């Protein structure tokens, strides 16, 4: 039942952010939340070319390195690397055939489309660094503890998407299919976009940054300059990505769009809290492998789980959650000369 | 069903472009056809903003314009617009479920991003030559000799999009939904993607470019410059759009891609010559509306419809279907001016 172009004239303004009348007229003259469009904005201002970046110099700087401290540099690398393909097609399978308004559905699309970027620069990076990009790359598909820690990602996309297509063809109600008793609730439909939603702010807010922390400490050490180049232009994308989803969860939650979204974000908000947990606990365990060979000076376990601890609060913070652990300071000041 | 990220470990050199196993890491060191990198490259390269294109004479030149002349230039607008709003989700939401191999996904969203510039370029025109854009961008919607061409894309979109939906959640066979039968063969969802390829073919290469004349026209008696500089980057874009749905065409026939498509696509040929021709007289009638009140310097109904009859005819043959127009060189060489 979704459609590339709905022919009902109707008032953008006034429809939800998810649900409503797909999108037919692209317009940007107006909206119903300017700060999409002001995302969009930002985000085309942002633009840059991965490749025009020299990485020469890392190559010296990546066989230099001790085996250990190249371990930590190309596992966190294939992680990103692995982050970075799921988001470069997921909010595009998974949102675009439920937004409703038009700045959302663009900002989407653009959003994606940095992501896809990124990738590119992490294949840039790679192809530079490695002699054989393919034992990389093949390595992420494989390779248990990369997938440990992104557990949960891909399967929550396709659950949605699945239920989508179920919503789209069938329509709400009780259904009988091959046999087999059918359930499609709307209501059901949002909360699993509403968790997904959260879920994407967590991987946006905390799993890129505690990512970028393991990159940034050996540009601390002068090494890896234009991998640390790229972050720092990644991260700048990623700042707005999360402000994006940040404001989109918020905006549900205030019942000044979608009403039931409003009840939505109240009844899921221990799911939501436990997805954070879940997140922050996936990232910590990540240190047992990451650091398996040995850690460097300033960049160990104890230190990436203080961090994990620091981020993770204030992006619960950010959303209307109750903070899990205890508050602190930052354990890794040095991070902010990089970022933002 | 679908994935976000197949976990089996799959050479993606080996996989077809379509129906094969879901992409899952996003690489670019290496490709199955190099056509499609190369394309992406080209389209980020030439990225552009429209807001920085100067167009503030070109509200008072619409003004000074003939009654019919406006008629010409902004229903020509309005369907440019609408063939953008469909072209800038569409790509995305019903291929990026099937596609098989990184180059082509990736180019599939690089495409679709750069058609919501081209949204956002014909915003900013409209918004800056007529009073209240809101009057505008609603008569595309309900506008009648426009939602004709519309109904016939859209339709080969959500067709595809829907039956991808039931092949994903129940896969081949003869099925039973809330008693009725619903067969999914995978054989007639390639052909179905086969359709919608050669439609939005005839999107790219056909219509799009017949509106670049009726838009250019102006241009060359020195009217609606703002316009005119926009559409060329446009065009330049859309040269870029047409050469990678003819190469995916071509892969799919000559069958070195998948042998089933190459079979598939000799069977239903004589229907894609009929779909091409459709298109070519929808572009035709269109004329018959536009030159309603009056014809302009360098643009009628006649010219017009040679102009089609040329395009079709080589586009027809780019991708190995029979002419169905008497040859002729082009009827509007000046043209040449501003095409790539
Ligand atoms: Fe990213
Ligand atoms: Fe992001
Ligand atoms: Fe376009
Ligand atoms: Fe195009
Ligand atoms: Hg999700
Ligand atoms: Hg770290
Ligand atoms: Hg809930
Ligand atoms: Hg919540
Ligand atoms: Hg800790
Ligand atoms: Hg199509
Ligand atoms: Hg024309
Ligand atoms: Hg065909
Ligand atoms: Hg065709």
Not at 132 to 159: C, L
Request: include cysteine; charge should be negative; proline fraction near 4%.
């Amino acid at each position: 039942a979704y459609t590339t172009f709905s022919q009902t004239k109707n008032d953008q303004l006034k429809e939800p952010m998810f649900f409503g009348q797909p999108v037919n007229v692209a317009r940007y003259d107006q909206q119903k939340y300017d700060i999409f469009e002001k995302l969009i904005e930002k985000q085309l201002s942002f633009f840059f070319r991965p490749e025009e970046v020299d990485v020469s110099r890392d190559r010296i700087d990546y066989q230099a390195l001790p085996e250990h401290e190249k371990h930590i540099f190309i596992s966190n690398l294939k992680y990103q690397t692995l982050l970075e393909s799921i988001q470069g097609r997921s909010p595009n399978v998974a949102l675009l055939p439920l937004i409703s308004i038009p700045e959302l559905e663009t900002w989407v699309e653009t959003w994606a489309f940095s992501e896809t970027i990124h990738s590119r620069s992490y294949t840039h990076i790679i192809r530079n660094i490695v002699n054989d990009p393919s034992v990389v790359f093949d390595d992420i598909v494989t390779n248990e503890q990369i997938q440990k820690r992104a557990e949960g990602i891909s399967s929550y996309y396709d659950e949605l998407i699945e239920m989508t297509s179920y919503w789209h063809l069938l329509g709400e109600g009780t259904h009988t299919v091959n046999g087999k008793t059918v359930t499609v609730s709307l209501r059901e439909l949002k909360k699993k976009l509403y968790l997904c939603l959260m879920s994407v702010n967590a991987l946006e807010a905390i799993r890129f940054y505690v990512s970028f922390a393991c990159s940034f400490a050996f540009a601390e050490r002068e090494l890896m300059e234009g991998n640390a180049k790229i972050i720092r232009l990644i991260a700048r994308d990623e700042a707005l990505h999360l402000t994006g989803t940040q404001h989109m969860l918020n905006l549900l939650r205030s019942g000044a769009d979608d009403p039931e979204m409003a009840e939505i974000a109240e009844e899921c908000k221990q799911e939501c809290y436990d997805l954070f947990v879940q997140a922050a606990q996936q990232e910590k365990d990540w240190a047992d492998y990451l650091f398996r060979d040995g850690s460097m000076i300033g960049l160990n376990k104890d230190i990436l789980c203080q961090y994990v601890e620091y981020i993770t609060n204030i992006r619960m913070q950010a959303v209307g959650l109750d903070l899990p652990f205890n508050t602190r300071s930052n354990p890794i000041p040095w991070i902010n000369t990089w970022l933002v």
